[PDB]
Symmetry: C6
Subunit: 173 residues, 6 copies
């Protein structure tokens, strides 16, 4: 079943790209403008938002998508260069894709977890002692996080299946 | 009368895609900025809006449209792969499209109902006791909800008609 | 003189599409942000705006344009399907176009009238008793309404002329 | 001189289209948000802005550009219809273009004049007695007005030159 | 070495177009929104901004780019018309391009100078007596001004070099 | 191993362009609107922001990308001109690309350093004495700065490898 796997992998990749490109930017548009803290201290909002969300989910996902697409670009550009052999570059491409996908999945888990809480406790200067801040659209962002994790897991499973189909001996040699 | 069924199904799909892509984003642009609650508590607006609208209608509809289009993408990519058999894949594609359409229709009904009320009663922290909040353009959103439900129902009916035309004994084998 | 009728109908259809697509969205951008009521009651602005403009003109016109274009899409897709009889489908397409255009013209008349007043009287909860609200750029919207009505009327006249040229007997059979 | 005339006319038309499409929308973006009146009366700003600028310059110019391009569209569509005589249609097209250009130039002069003043005196309800309002970017709008008038005048002159070259007797039809 | 002159001129023109189109609009987006005057007079901000920046740099540069591109469009349209002689039109096009570029460079210098100050002294009605206003991103705008002046100077030098590489006696005839 | 060098260089260039074009503008959208200083002095925010960020990172990076791409455009246009020799131009193109890349990397290091602090101390007129200002999303901008520096360093290394592969005696002649 080395063909159905490829079909599903291509479809899933296109699905992820389309979903992100269409809705992600809109979801995270008012992330800072609607972030509010219970305080009168100027600059507390900026510091607390920066501490709560060091990197927005959307930018992480864009970086992941481009990086995961990169090895296919390498293979295609090499194929173009060859004309005006290739059977070897394919295995390395698959291995690198596997490694990148697994790394990005683990990175997402360790960076963001599985949920976006509605409240945040912030004790960064210039905020006095500890203050409470309130997040915008926590539930939608939690749903997006879980959905992206699931799609990435499906991609990892399909890539591993293809790699196992290729075989240990071919990879090692 | 299966050919006219395909013609109408294609036209309805294109119509739904065009309507959503052109107006949906504009309709729901100020959903949170014009959402206001009668209170002085910081962060009550954010929590109450998140509780009232866990997932925006537009994002659900975009997800539904892409997911419903997915099986056709699978079939097309399989056909491309085969050249440089197909009669069987068509029935499975039709069945999966039917299932996805029915599931998304039921999900819309159970998530959103048939109307968007103008008032919302909210009792989520940090709001004190129970507060009243006011929604932005509820009537237009209700019209959009009903229209999308009707279009999805028409799509479901056409898909069922085509599947019945195929007959039970081809699906079984 | 059926040929000049077709030429003019195509030209006016393109003209309406271009005008709407280029200006309509910008005309109605600040419809709600610039809508203000003389009151201190939270939520009165939202309710009064929703009551005054249940559906924006621009969205009604977009729906009308797509719906009126739909029969041509049906005919074109049927023609594509036939290649890899047609004379009968043309008359049905013309009749359906006539009906849709007339229906949308009547609907516009009964929904919006011929003018957008600068003042609105609103007595919807939570507004206390009856309040006065002020509309954004009413004159431009009135001009747009009248222009769209005139263009739709011209389209109706041309469609009726073409249908009359076809003849009653052909329509019956 | 008939050839260089057409060359210049085409170049000038393209120039006008490009200038408007690129800068006009940006110039008139904050026309209402930056329009302020010296008053405390709710709704005075909206009424006075509507009175001062019943139709924005940009929308008038877009309408003029599309309407002036329409006769060429009619001629092109007629030519397409003929293939799968034309000498006659060209003269009528030129005459109609002349008439439309002259009409739009006169309309601009009578609607807007040659300058946008920085102050406006407004006595429309709900404003009490008479109030002073202040316009946004009056000088840039005046420059745009004069430039568009000059370009339209050049177009009118070129069209009249072409019409004269055609001759009275040929157009006597 | 005329050929490398053509390469350099073309690449410089493309570079200017790309830089302006990509960054200029974003640089001058908040020119008026972030313009502040130390006063309580309503309407003083509008008048002071209008007197300080009668025409935005970006619009002047767009006008310059389109105008300097125009003669090439004239030449290309003439060439297209010729098929379904040319060696002569080219020198006139070169001369006109050179004159236009020099004129726009001189106009830039005489209209904006070489710097954008952070402070402005405004003395225009309705501002009481003399007021002080503060500009948005003066340093970035100064850098943009100097860069555009340098690019235009390079274009002027290359145009003169091309004109000389042709020679005086062909220009005379 | 010069071919893999070219493959990697092309892929890295495309990667940088895509990342910047997709996320950079959104990262720096609210750089000035969310910049706040602890003061009551009008115009202090503008002056302090202008002093802290004379040129935005995004515009510097756009300029760098276009400038680094320029030599390839020169080579391509020269090749186009030659048809309706080239071996020499390639070496000069490579040398100029190397010089531009190194210069832009050094310029970035000397202009911005390796971090964006969350606090800024500002003593520019009209601010009284010395005030404290707070930056918007400093952490994301720090990450972007470091990532761009790393990508530019990789490009420099690949360019140096290719230039060394060409060797000194070819460059000298
Ligand atoms: O410009 C934005 C965008 C473009 C593109 C691309 F150029 F690759 F097609 N990719 C995007 C992505 C990406 F696909 F993950 F790369 C995410 C978010 C916005 C994207 C989108 C495009 C759709 C409409 C909203 N902005
Ligand atoms: O980028 C937005 C958008 C694009 C596209 C797509 F790229 F697939 F064509 N699909 C959209 C959809 C759709 F449902 F996926 F079709 C919904 C809302 C906005 C969409 C729209 C496009 C029209 C102008 C407003 N933004
Ligand atoms: O995306 C918007 C838009 C697109 C399109 C379409 F995709 F069919 F071409 N149709 C639009 C329509 C139309 F009526 F469907 F033609 C109305 C308003 C905006 C439209 C416009 C397009 C021009 C620039 C402003 N947004
Ligand atoms: O969508 C807007 C627009 C488009 C077009 C068209 F689709 F015909 F090319 N024409 C426009 C016009 C024009 F006059 F019809 F040319 C004016 C203003 C904006 C226009 C512009 C396009 C350039 C970027 C800013 N919006
Ligand atoms: O619509 C804007 C724009 C377009 C164009 C054109 F249509 F000719 F390609 N030219 C622009 C110019 C230019 F100088 F005419 F090239 C300047 C500024 C913005 C421009 C840009 C295009 C890139 C993305 C930001 N808006
Ligand atoms: O118009 C913006 C943009 C365009 C382009 C170009 F026209 F060259 F492709 N280049 C951009 C660049 C680039 F560095 F020049 F590539 C940076 C930031 C935004 C860019 C982007 C394009 C993708 C969607 C968001 N705006």
């Amino acid at each position: 079943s080395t063909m159905i796997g490829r079909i599903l992998l291509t479809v899933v990749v296109i699905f992820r790209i389309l979903i992100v490109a269409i809705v992600g930017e809109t979801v995270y548009d008012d992330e800072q403008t609607m972030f509010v803290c219970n305080t009168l201290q100027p600059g507390c909002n900026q510091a607390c938002y920066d501490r709560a969300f060091p990197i927005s989910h959307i930018r992480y996902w864009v970086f992941q998508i481009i990086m995961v697409c990169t090895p296919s670009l390498c293979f295609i550009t090499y194929s173009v260069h060859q004309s005006a052999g290739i059977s070897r570059f394919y295995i390395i491409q698959v291995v690198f894709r596997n490694a990148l996908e697994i790394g990005f999945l683990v990175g997402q888990y360790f960076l963001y977890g599985f949920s976006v809480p509605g409240l945040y406790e912030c004790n960064r200067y210039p905020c006095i002692k500890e203050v409470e801040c309130y997040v915008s659209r926590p539930t939608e962002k939690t749903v997006f996080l879980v959905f992206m994790f699931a799609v990435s897991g499906i991609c990892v499973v399909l890539n591993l299946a293809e790699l196992n189909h290729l075989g240990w001996r071919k990879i090692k040699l």
